[PDB]
Write a protein that binds this ligand. Structure first.
Ligand SMILES: OC[C@H]1O[C@H](O[C@H]2[C@H](O)[C@@H](O)[C@@H](O[C@H]3[C@H](O)[C@@H](O)[C@@H](O[C@H]4[C@H](O)[C@@H](O)[C@@H](O[C@H]5[C@H](O)[C@@H](O)[C@@H](O[C@H]6[C@H](O)[C@@H](O)[C@@H](O[C@H]7[C@H](O)[C@@H](O)[C@@H](O)O[C@@H]7CO)O[C@@H]6CO)O[C@@H]5CO)O[C@@H]4CO)O[C@@H]3CO)O[C@@H]2CO)[C@H](O)[C@@H](O)[C@@H]1O
Length: 476
């Protein structure tokens, strides 16, 4: 009797490329590419288990742009430049960016603490700040090549910094290939999402917000987004086929978001399986075991992730020592295993790039201990998505209706329902009436609405500038 364990690491970045200037206004795609997007699948070279990945098409577009040397990245130019050539504005952004990341364990360099305690910075100190910002995002693979520079800790030259950049761009150029490689070796499945990561249920039917939050106020949706919802899915299928050579039969719905109408859309577009959130399961059915393969109206397979295990990795285990966290994780799988007659299916689904920066050593002690330990538990079988979709010896159940929501509390309030978030929807609704091109699809990505109307964090104004630029460009 086995427990079936399915990791599904979701990788996404909204489009940071401003459409009028072509500049990448935040460097987060570059930094998560060099730290995580290559290195998360690359674990499969060293550990013989199954791990699955989701890549949004908008992320893939940006990785390709960086791999070609085409990406004009404003912050990265502030890193690359000799400090003598830095504008005052570029020095401020470098200092701001350091302070934002300063308490993260990946930034724990003695030299950074000293630099941030100085009132002014000369060229040598700025060179250190530039290079250490780069070295802080070093991924597992380059830890070996760059160990000399990591141990040096200070007194970096312009040529050492350019060496690090050259090795980082080599990593980016290999990033799409490693996803192809682990798929072709059978080591993991790769999925995608609707193209710009929108909230499909709201594009199809905004009234679905009332199923969980009946008293919320939303704008007047006087235009249809339903064919845009189709286009997001259709364009992602085309991109996926081009990159990976298959029609996608599974997709990750952005923010785990589902509704009855969204499930019908996915099925109509040929999607046979997806996953979503446990809170949605509990909001929708009575005997709500998340260890079953569900069939929505006998038409599309639906797994519900184990929210606790997914949240433990995402939010809690960063502060634990690696042995304790892995013992706790395995102990929780043991409890699941002993609590049921059948072979349970355990989906662990979370973002694959955002949590590691809070773990000691960028999560490498934790993930190496976890994957090493899973390799030796005979009663746990890690599965690809294809295997989980087809495994015959699992328990199943038919489900006829879901309560629309997302993995944020089972509802849509992170993206709609207050004055500021509603103002973005109103802008989009008005722009949709005059849209002439697919930049209206870009503006439907969930991220713009996520950041809107929150407490003012650094660079939040950049997301707003991008959103409105795509909305403006869509109408021309
Ligand atoms: O809340 C305040 C916040 O303050 C601090 O966080 C700081 C960061 O420390 C700082 O670096 C910066 O954030 C940067 C970030 O570093 C950049 O990489 C980038 O963020 C990207 C991100 O990297 C991308 O992956 C993408 O994020 C999408 C994501 O792909 C998508 O799946 C979804 O994911 C979030 C989801 O919507 C949330 O509900 C939650 O998910 C949880 C649920 O909460 C929970 O209930 C549970 O069951 O499951 C869920 C899954 O784990 O978190 C998910 C993120 O992991 O949406 C996001 C966002 O759309 O794109 C973003 C960019 O859009 O840019 C940012 C901003 O510059 O600044 C922030 C804030 O200042 C603090 O350390 C942190 O803990 C606090 O949360």
């Amino acid at each position: 009797k086995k427990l079936f364990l399915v990791f599904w690491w979701h990788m996404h970045q909204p489009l940071y490329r401003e459409p009028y200037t072509g500049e990448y206004l935040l460097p987060w795609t570059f930094f998560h590419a060099v730290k995580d997007y290559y290195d998360m699948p690359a674990y499969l070279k060293d550990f013989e288990i199954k791990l699955n990945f989701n890549l949004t098409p908008v992320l893939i577009d940006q990785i390709q742009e960086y791999a070609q040397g085409k990406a004009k990245d404003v912050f990265l130019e502030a890193i690359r430049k000799d400090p003598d050539d830095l504008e005052k504005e570029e020095v401020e952004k470098l200092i701001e960016f350091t302070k934002l990341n300063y308490e993260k364990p990946i930034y724990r360099f003695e030299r950074i603490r000293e630099l941030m305690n100085k009132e002014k910075l000369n060229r040598e100190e700025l060179l250190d700040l530039q290079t250490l910002n780069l070295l802080a995002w070093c991924g597992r693979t380059l830890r070996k090549d760059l160990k000399d520079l990591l141990n040096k800790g200070r007194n970096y030259t312009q040529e050492e910094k350019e060496y690090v950049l050259n090795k980082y761009f080599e990593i980016i150029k290999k990033t799409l290939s490693i996803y192809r490689e682990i798929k072709e070796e059978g080591k993991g499945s790769v999925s995608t999402s609707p193209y710009y990561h929108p909230l499909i249920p709201i594009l199809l039917n905004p009234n679905c917000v009332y199923e969980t939050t009946p008293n919320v106020k939303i704008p007047d949706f006087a235009v249809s987004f339903r064919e845009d919802a189709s286009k997001h899915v259709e364009l992602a299928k085309e991109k996926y086929f081009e990159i990976f050579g298959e029609h996608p039969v599974y997709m990750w719905p952005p923010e785990a978001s589902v509704s009855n109408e969204a499930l019908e859309l996915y099925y109509e577009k040929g999607i046979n399986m997806l996953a979503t959130d446990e809170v949605i399961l509990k909001n929708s059915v009575e005997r709500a075991s998340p260890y079953l393969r569900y069939y929505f109206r006998e038409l599309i397979s639906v797994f519900f992730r184990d929210k606790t295990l997914s949240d433990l990795i995402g939010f809690s285990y960063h502060a634990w020592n690696a042995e304790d966290a892995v013992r706790d994780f395995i102990g929780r799988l043991k409890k699941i295993h002993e609590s049921v007659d059948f072979q349970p299916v355990v989906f662990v689904v979370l973002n694959g790039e955002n949590c590691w920066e809070y773990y000691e050593e960028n999560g490498i002690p934790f993930l190496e201990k976890l994957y090493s330990t899973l390799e030796k538990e005979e009663w746990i079988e890690t599965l690809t998505l294809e295997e989980a979709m087809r495994k015959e010896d699992v328990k199943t159940e038919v489900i006829e209706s879901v309560k629309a929501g997302t993995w944020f509390d089972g509802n849509f309030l992170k993206w709609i329902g207050n004055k500021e978030k509603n103002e973005y929807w109103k802008i989009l609704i008005e722009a949709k009436k005059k849209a002439k091109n697919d930049y209206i699809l870009v503006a439907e990505g969930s991220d713009w609405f996520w950041w809107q109307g929150e407490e003012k964090a650094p660079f939040v104004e950049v997301f707003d500038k991008l959103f409105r630029s795509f909305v403006r460009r869509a109408q021309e």
